Amino acid sequence: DKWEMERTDITMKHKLGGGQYGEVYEGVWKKYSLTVAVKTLKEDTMEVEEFLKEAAVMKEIKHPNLVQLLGVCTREPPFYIITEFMTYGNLLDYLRECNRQEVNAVVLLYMATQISSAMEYLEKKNFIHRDLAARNCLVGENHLVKVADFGLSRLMTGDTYTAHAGAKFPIKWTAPESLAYNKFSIKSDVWAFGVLLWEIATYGMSPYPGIDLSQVYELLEKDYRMERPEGCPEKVYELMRACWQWNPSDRPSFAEIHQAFETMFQESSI
Ligand SMILES: COc1cc(Nc2c(C#N)cnc3cc(OCCCN4CCN(C)CC4)c(OC)cc23)c(Cl)cc1Cl
């Protein structure tokens, strides 16, 4: 298959975390002397189908702000997904721990711009991401941000993907139509992206603070939305609000979102 490699080609270095879809390691791809991230699957389990689903999809994708697949090991346990190493880890912990004088307003714009660029790409390729949130974005040197892409679905025929009944979603990031009917689309991602913008603007606060999960849907029904975070530019909140339109069709495209952030980033850098 050519994405296939010898498991003996990697040496494991440190556990970084995991559970999960599988546990995650810092590793070294020996013949390139290259630090890499390795997702692992101990034995066969029920979650093996999950695994190669990710693997398959990640091969179909290439973008500067999408985590680059390097190789896979899928002939027998253990199982390896191998990606580039995102040095600073996830964006949520990053925002929370950063030096805000360094990671300032111009930088937050840069990060929104980078993410929206990735999502514009997925929009065109007819992909949806099932879990857009700060925790699923990764950070490298110099405020480089990439969206993690193990949880992607290709739209094979049409507009909306339907998740299996009984599926649990991260309530606070999830579009109304997704919570209600289990339907995901690129416009559901646009909604989630709105939440992501709020996380970025607040340096990683939890969305709908103190609000009871079980009541979020009802609130959204009655046009309750999160308020403008402190220091968030009015235009940025306007976009947030556009992302959170009740009708999917009323929400902007990622092409529009990216264009808008590109413009704001150019002006901020001037
Ligand atoms: C390869 O397979 C997969 C791997 C992943 N997950 C990761 C990808 C990817 N992709 C890339 N890069 C990662 C870097 C990580 O931490 C590196 C440094 C952390 N530190 C925090 C403390 N300080 C300050 C030093 C830095 C990390 O930690 C858990 C997970 C990463 C996913 Cl989500 C899915 C699949 Cl399929």
Author numbering: 233 to 502
Authors' account:
Anomalous difference maps calculated using the phases from the refined molecular model show strong peaks (greater than 4 standard deviations above the mean) for the chlorine atoms of the drug in the ortho and para positions on the aniline ring, confirming the identity of the compound. Bosutinib occupies the ATP-binding site of Abl, sandwiched between the N-terminal and C-terminal lobes of the kinase. The only hydrogen bond formed between bosutinib and Abl is between the quinoline N1 nitrogen atom and the backbone amide of M318 (a residue in the hinge region of the kinase), a characteristic feature of the binding mode of this class of inhibitors. The 2,4-dichloro-5-methoxy aniline fragment of bosutinib is oriented at a ∼65° angle to the plane of the quinoline heterocycle and fills a hydrophobic pocket formed by residues projecting from the N-lobe into the ATP-binding site. The sidechain of T315 is completely enveloped by bosutinib, making extensive van der Waals contacts with both the nitrile group and the 5-methoxy group of the aniline ring. Both the T315I and V299L mutations would result in steric clashes with bosutinib, explaining why these mutations confer resistance to bosutinib.
Chronic myeloid leukemia (CML) is the result of the constitutive kinase activity of the tyrosine kinase BCR-Abl, the product of the bcr-abl gene fusion present on the Philadelphia chromosomes of patients with CML. Bosutinib is a second-generation dual Abl/Src inhibitor that exhibits potent growth inhibition of CML cells in vitro, is active against multiple imatinib-resistant BCR-Abl mutations and has demonstrated efficacy in ongoing clinical trials for imatinib-resistant CML. In the course of studies of electrostatic interactions in the ATP-binding sites of several kinases, briefly outlined at the end of this report, we determined the crystal structure of the kinase domain of Abl bound to bosutinib at 2.4 angstrom resolution. The structure explains the effects of imatinib resistance mutations on bosutinib binding, and provides a basis for interpreting spectroscopic measurements that probe the environment of the ATP-binding site of Abl and other kinases.
